[PDB]
Scaffold this motif. Sequence first.
Motif, PDB file in Angstrom:
ATOM      1  N   UNK A 120      31.427 -71.297  18.856  1.00 21.14           N
ATOM      2  CA  UNK A 120      31.165 -69.881  19.083  1.00 21.14           C
ATOM      3  C   UNK A 120      32.451 -69.115  19.367  1.00 21.14           C
ATOM      4  N   UNK A 121      33.436 -69.768  19.987  1.00 21.40           N
ATOM      5  CA  UNK A 121      34.713 -69.107  20.233  1.00 21.40           C
ATOM      6  C   UNK A 121      35.537 -69.051  18.952  1.00 21.40           C
ATOM      7  N   UNK A 122      35.449 -70.096  18.124  1.00 19.17           N
ATOM      8  CA  UNK A 122      36.213 -70.131  16.880  1.00 19.17           C
ATOM      9  C   UNK A 122      35.666 -69.133  15.866  1.00 19.17           C
TER      10      UNK A 122
ATOM     11  N   UNK B 158      34.251 -66.410  16.728  1.00 21.84           N
ATOM     12  CA  UNK B 158      34.558 -65.085  17.251  1.00 21.84           C
ATOM     13  C   UNK B 158      35.998 -64.690  16.945  1.00 21.84           C
ATOM     14  N   UNK B 159      36.953 -65.596  17.190  1.00 22.00           N
ATOM     15  CA  UNK B 159      38.362 -65.259  17.007  1.00 22.00           C
ATOM     16  C   UNK B 159      38.737 -65.155  15.533  1.00 22.00           C
TER      17      UNK B 159
ATOM     18  N   UNK C 164      36.442 -63.777  13.420  1.00 19.36           N
ATOM     19  CA  UNK C 164      35.887 -62.449  13.182  1.00 19.36           C
ATOM     20  C   UNK C 164      36.660 -61.366  13.924  1.00 19.36           C
ATOM     21  N   UNK C 165      37.278 -61.701  15.061  1.00 17.50           N
ATOM     22  CA  UNK C 165      38.115 -60.725  15.754  1.00 17.50           C
ATOM     23  C   UNK C 165      39.419 -60.491  15.005  1.00 17.50           C
ATOM     24  N   UNK C 166      39.985 -61.545  14.412  1.00 17.41           N
ATOM     25  CA  UNK C 166      41.156 -61.367  13.561  1.00 17.41           C
ATOM     26  C   UNK C 166      40.790 -60.698  12.244  1.00 17.41           C
TER      27      UNK C 166
ATOM     28  N   UNK D 167      26.940 -59.458  11.868  1.00 16.80           N
ATOM     29  CA  UNK D 167      27.167 -60.890  11.720  1.00 16.80           C
ATOM     30  C   UNK D 167      25.868 -61.626  12.013  1.00 16.80           C
TER      31      UNK D 167
ATOM     32  N   UNK E 214      24.510 -65.155  12.528  1.00 14.55           N
ATOM     33  CA  UNK E 214      24.853 -66.548  12.790  1.00 14.55           C
ATOM     34  C   UNK E 214      24.163 -66.986  14.075  1.00 14.55           C
TER      35      UNK E 214
ATOM     36  N   UNK F 122      25.080 -68.806  21.126  1.00 15.17           N
ATOM     37  CA  UNK F 122      24.791 -69.725  22.215  1.00 15.17           C
ATOM     38  C   UNK F 122      24.069 -68.965  23.324  1.00 15.17           C
TER      39      UNK F 122
ATOM     40  N   UNK G  79      34.143 -66.900  28.542  1.00 18.08           N
ATOM     41  CA  UNK G  79      34.222 -66.698  27.099  1.00 18.08           C
ATOM     42  C   UNK G  79      33.402 -65.480  26.685  1.00 18.08           C
TER      43      UNK G  79
ATOM     44  N   UNK H 199      34.813 -61.480  25.171  1.00 19.37           N
ATOM     45  CA  UNK H 199      34.523 -60.930  23.849  1.00 19.37           C
ATOM     46  C   UNK H 199      33.623 -59.703  23.926  1.00 19.37           C
TER      47      UNK H 199
ATOM     48  N   UNK I 186      35.170 -56.419  22.461  1.00 21.98           N
ATOM     49  CA  UNK I 186      34.434 -55.508  21.593  1.00 21.98           C
ATOM     50  C   UNK I 186      34.315 -54.125  22.216  1.00 21.98           C
TER      51      UNK I 186
ATOM     52  N   UNK J   9      42.875 -73.414  24.558  1.00 21.92           N
ATOM     53  CA  UNK J   9      42.836 -72.649  23.316  1.00 21.92           C
ATOM     54  C   UNK J   9      42.061 -71.349  23.499  1.00 21.92           C
TER      55      UNK J   9
ATOM     56  N   UNK K 120      44.201 -67.685  23.245  1.00 24.48           N
ATOM     57  CA  UNK K 120      43.743 -66.730  22.242  1.00 24.48           C
ATOM     58  C   UNK K 120      43.656 -65.323  22.819  1.00 24.48           C
TER      59      UNK K 120
ATOM     60  N   UNK L 255      45.462 -62.119  21.887  1.00 25.30           N
ATOM     61  CA  UNK L 255      44.668 -60.986  21.420  1.00 25.30           C
ATOM     62  C   UNK L 255      44.988 -59.725  22.213  1.00 25.30           C
TER      63      UNK L 255
END
Lengths: 165, 165, 165, 229, 55
Positions: A76-78, A80-81, A83-85, B54, B56, B59, B77, B81, B85, C76, C80, C84
Amino acid sequence: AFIENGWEGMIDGWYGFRHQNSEGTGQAADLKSTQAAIDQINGKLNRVIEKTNEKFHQIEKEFSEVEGRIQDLEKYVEDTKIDLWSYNAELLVALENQHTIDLTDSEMNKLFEKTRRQLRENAEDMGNGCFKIYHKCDNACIESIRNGTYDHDVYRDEALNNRFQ
Amino acid sequence: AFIENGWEGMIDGWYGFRHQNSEGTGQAADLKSTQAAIDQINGKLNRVIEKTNEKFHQIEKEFSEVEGRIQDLEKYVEDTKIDLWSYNAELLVALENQHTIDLTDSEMNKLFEKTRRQLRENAEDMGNGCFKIYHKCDNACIESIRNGTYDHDVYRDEALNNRFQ
Amino acid sequence: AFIENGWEGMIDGWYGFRHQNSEGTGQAADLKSTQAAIDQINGKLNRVIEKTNEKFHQIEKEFSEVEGRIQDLEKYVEDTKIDLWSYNAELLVALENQHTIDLTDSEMNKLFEKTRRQLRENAEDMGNGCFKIYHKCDNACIESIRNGTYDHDVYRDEALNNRFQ
Amino acid sequence: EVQLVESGGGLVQPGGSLRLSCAASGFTFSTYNMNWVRQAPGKGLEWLSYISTSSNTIYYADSVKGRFTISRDNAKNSLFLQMNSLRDEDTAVYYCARDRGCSSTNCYVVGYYFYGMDVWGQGTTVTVSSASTKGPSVFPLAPSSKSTSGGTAALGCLVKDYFPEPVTVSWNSGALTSGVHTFPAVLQSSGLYSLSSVVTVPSSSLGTQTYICNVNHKPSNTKVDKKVE
Amino acid sequence: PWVRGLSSRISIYWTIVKPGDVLVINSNGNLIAPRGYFKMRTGKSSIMRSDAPID
């Protein structure tokens, strides 16, 4: 887009002039306004495409064996980052393309201001990005406004007799 | 805000003109500058409010049983985000409202440039967004500058006798 | 940068005028265009440097005992959001400095438009940010354009006899 | 890496014609601008010409007056510096340089010559003189006691009327190197170069130590050894 | 299950020893002894799964 059309034959610069007098026609790139625009364009490139990388130890992003909550947290973090990038890519590059049209409009406005501050009582606009010179302007007169060394008081008495008459 | 006041009675467009001559008064929306502005306004909407979702599997974000470190990782986390956002919402929409005032100023500047490229020796500005026409301008003359089909060489000999005299 | 040079002796405002007539010289800060610019400058500050903090319970970001996957996930995660926030710092403050130069250019353009809407048939530009007044302008005439109370029809018959002659 | 190699040099007479070259490697030659800057002996740098990638914007200096012609070819990635109507003042070392283009670190969009030239080549020596190759004439110098309290005496050899420059001059075939000073060549009335070389030696080794001034010239193969005593 | 002919496996667990600590390994069965250790260097290295050749 109030420029009606550009110049396809001028491949020696981003900007320039198209002279037309008794000594013939031709195109000549402006050495002042073109170089002043690339410093604003290439300055936008080297702070984005150069020296913006991160060298560090990352973690595993793709898994073949499904474990459970430990893999569901990092997924979920991967996602997000990424989609944030991707959202920052749609925020930066779309605004960088928007500012570049505004930059070329501002460089045209500065070129219209540099030409407008020397052709007040000597010339007038035409409506398609061209200036109607009301006096005799040879090839040395074209290079005077191109290099910014044009004099207003010299050609004042000649063009004022044909502007309003 | 140098426009002193707008027009509340013109509800058929974002821009337009207010004519005043011997044939009466009235308001008429410009079909050229208004439609060219909505293409820039609605282009900002469909790339933000449309096709930006999105789909998907996420969690669990709210918990009733406090487990410990596994819940403390996803809590920091999720709160980041959401704030990322929210910071991007305060970065995009505040700049989109800032650019829209600059867009309506640029669309007014293009409307002042389209009117300025046809009324050099024929009219002058007044200071409140209005142009002082120094010649006879009927309802067909108003629609000529509205549709962009106005001629400068026709009304040149009439307005120059009353502009500087 | 078409202003050749500013004014170092004017320390009572961001903008102003430099008068020169038979009653002497001097510098005076404009009370209208300077105050209208600080409202746009200081409005950019308080929405960034003020009331933008987050008060919440964070997690441990530095560890001395290396445990394994539980510390590798949050490492990680933390690196990030630091990058960010650093990328957003290079996105906001670099654009806020870019817009401020465009804001001071727009406030100069509004000052050139406020002076240009009162000096059409009364004065002309010089090319270095100064206006060439073609009539008698005392200290009360300087304060009339500074406060926006200048009249165009009063000094029309005096300056037109020396502008094109 | 980026490196510019020049060619086309040599010896020529006043009034001939040559064609220099500027070999480029390590970068795209069709995207960067080129120029022609020389370095006169005794004077500073002097810009001569400038060309663009489109080969339509060609500029010249005030001292050129159309006597030189600068061309390029994207298929060979080199320059064509034509030299016509030469004189004795044009005897210098020529260089070709690449323009920077922008004000940033790496210029992905190449501009013009408004931000210096960060790439320079090695250069080649182009000597424009009507004199032919002539061997050197070695003339010894008899030393004498001058410093009474110090007890030192200077000695050297005079290399005059030789062509071309330079001449590697040493002492005892490189055995005596301490205190040896090499003087640069200067122009004479006949157009030939002339220099000298001395060595600080004490006066106690005048009649004991043998000082042989070795003079060796490469393109003329002349080796004249004169004993300095 | 039958993996490479055998039906037995071994669980792997690691222990990082700090400078100044003493490692004490006591067991009464199913103990596998290490023959050495590795240096925990600090760098910008990582791992990557790939199938591309090396040129």
